[PDB]
Amino acid sequence: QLKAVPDIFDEISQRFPDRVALIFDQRKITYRELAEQCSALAAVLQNNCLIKGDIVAIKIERSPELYIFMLALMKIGAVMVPVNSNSPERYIGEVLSAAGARYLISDDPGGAWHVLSSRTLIQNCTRSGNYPVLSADDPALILMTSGSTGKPKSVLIAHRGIARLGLPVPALGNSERDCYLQIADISFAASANEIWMALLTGACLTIAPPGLPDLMALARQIESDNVTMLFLSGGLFRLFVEVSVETLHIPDCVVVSGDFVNPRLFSVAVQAGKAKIFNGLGCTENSAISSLYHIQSAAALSPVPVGTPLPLVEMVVFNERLQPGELFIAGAGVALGYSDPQLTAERFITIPYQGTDMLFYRTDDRATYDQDRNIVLVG
Ligand SMILES: Nc1ccccc1C(=O)NS(=O)(=O)NC[C@H]1O[C@@H](n2cnc3c(N)ncnc32)[C@H](O)[C@@H]1O
Ligand SMILES: [Cl-]
Numbered sequence: 001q002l003k004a005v006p007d008i009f010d011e012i013s014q015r016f017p018d019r020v021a022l023i024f025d026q027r028k029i030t031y032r033e034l035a036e037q038c039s040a041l042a043a044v045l046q047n048n049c050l051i052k053g054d055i056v057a058i059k060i061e062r063s064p065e066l067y068i069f070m071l072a073l074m075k076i077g078a079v080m081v082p083v084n085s086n087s088p089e090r091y092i093g094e095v096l097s098a099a100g101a102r103y104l105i106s107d108d109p110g111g112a113w114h115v116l117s118s119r120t121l122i123q124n125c126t127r128s129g130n131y132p133v134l135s136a137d138d139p140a141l142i143l144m145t146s147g148s149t150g151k152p153k154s155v156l157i158a159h160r161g162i163a164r165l166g167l168p169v170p171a172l173g174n175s176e177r178d179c180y181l182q183i184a185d186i187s188f189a190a191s192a193n194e195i196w197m198a199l200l201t202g203a204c205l206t207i208a209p210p211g212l213p214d215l216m217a218l219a220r221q222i223e224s225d226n227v228t229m230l231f232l233s234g235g236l237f238r239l240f241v242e243v244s245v246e247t248l249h250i251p252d253c254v255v256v257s258g259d260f261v262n263p264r265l266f267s268v269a270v271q272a273g274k275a276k277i278f279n280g281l282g283c284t285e286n287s288a289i290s291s292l293y294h295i296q297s298a299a300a301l302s303p304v305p306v307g308t309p310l311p312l313v314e315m316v317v318f319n320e321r322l323q324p325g326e327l328f329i330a331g332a333g334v335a336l337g338y339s340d341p342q343l344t345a346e347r348f349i350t351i352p353y354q355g356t357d358m359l360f361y362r363t364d365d366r367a368t369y370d371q372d373r374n375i376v377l378v379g
């Protein structure tokens with residue numbers, strides 16, 4: 001029984017009020033501090049005619065204020081459309097249109113939407129009442145994803161899709177003790193692993209500087225703020241293995257997700273220190289990270305497996321007759337669907353699995369299983 005994100009963050013900030021929530025450069029913000037500003041901004045947002053269900057795009061460079069907006073937007077039940085800060089003004093319009101945004105809140109287009117100054121909203125903060133009744137199935141965010149061919153499709157993600165990240169993952173052993181690094185762009189689903197596994201568990205989220213990755217700054221930041229849970233794309237992981245693999249063993253866990261990573265790169269990383277290196281699978285339509293496989297030995301490693309699902313995630317490889325290859329995902333992370341309701345039927349299908357009908361997302365990832373109970377993608 002998952003509650004909506006603000007309900008979870010509320011009781012998280014009430015439990016651990018004095019723990020550090022956000023770090024930027026050297027500025028620190030505690031959970032009680034963050035909760036007060038979130039409620040103050042949410043009241044400001046309501047003054048600006050924003051109501052529950054409004055489609056609100058966010059374009060704010062990495063900063064403490066960015067994640068206050070995220071919390072405030074979902075506290076007032078808005079549907080956030082995070083936009084990449086280096087996106088060209090033309091692709092901004094395509095994203096706003098495909099999501100049907102009524103607002104764009106930005107720190108720096110032309111369509112049926114209002115542009116709101118993020119700096120002015122922060123300046124207007126004076127908690128105020130009247131907050132919506134939010135369910136786990138209420139929409140929480142829209143993310144754009146491209147397929148093997150088509151144009152960018154909008155994916156409607158429910159509160160449960162990221163609220164599940166409040167539950168500790170057994171393969172990670174994470175808790176409020178941990179520290180996460182925010183480096184993945186907010187327009188990507190992978191960013192949800194870093195933002196919400198932190199804020200919804202009482203852990204710390206150190207924010208990387210805005211812009212393209214600065215591995216020197218990322219190196220000192222990973223150590224200075226003692227990052228324990230490091231999520232990485234395949235490119236950031238491979239580059240670190242090549243130029244500074246020692247950095248990958250300051251944390252306790254390193255999760256590589258996004259695409260096939262050469263098994264030799266995992267071998268160098270695992271043999272380099274005490275950090276548990278993971279291969280992870282995620283997709284936009286399942287809201288965030290979905291499975292994990294722990295690389296155990298330098299010679300234990302044939303595409304590396306993606307492992308076993310996260311809490312409340314169901315992952316099954318079905319045959320060609322929609323029965324048990326091809327990967328299907330069910331559970332709390334499944335998206336509400338696409339903007340196109342007809343393509344929604346094409347790739348979100350109800351399938352009987354162990355007695356009960358279950359809604360599965362059709363991933364289009366050819367796959368098969370391991371002997372030791374492990375999912376393995378194979379293009
Ligand atoms: N890397 C993430 C972490 C959390 C949430 C989403 C993502 C993500 O890639 N969202 S996507 O929509 O842009 N891409 C989704 C598609 O990418 C591919 N893929 C993702 N992980 C892996 C992996 N370990 N090995 C091989 N292939 C992978 C797959 O074909 C999946 O269907
Ligand atoms: Cl700016």
Ligand SMILES: [Cl-]
Nearest residue numbers: 082186191192
């Ligand atoms: Cl997000």
Ligand SMILES: [Cl-]
Nearest residue numbers: 061062210211
């Ligand atoms: Cl940024």
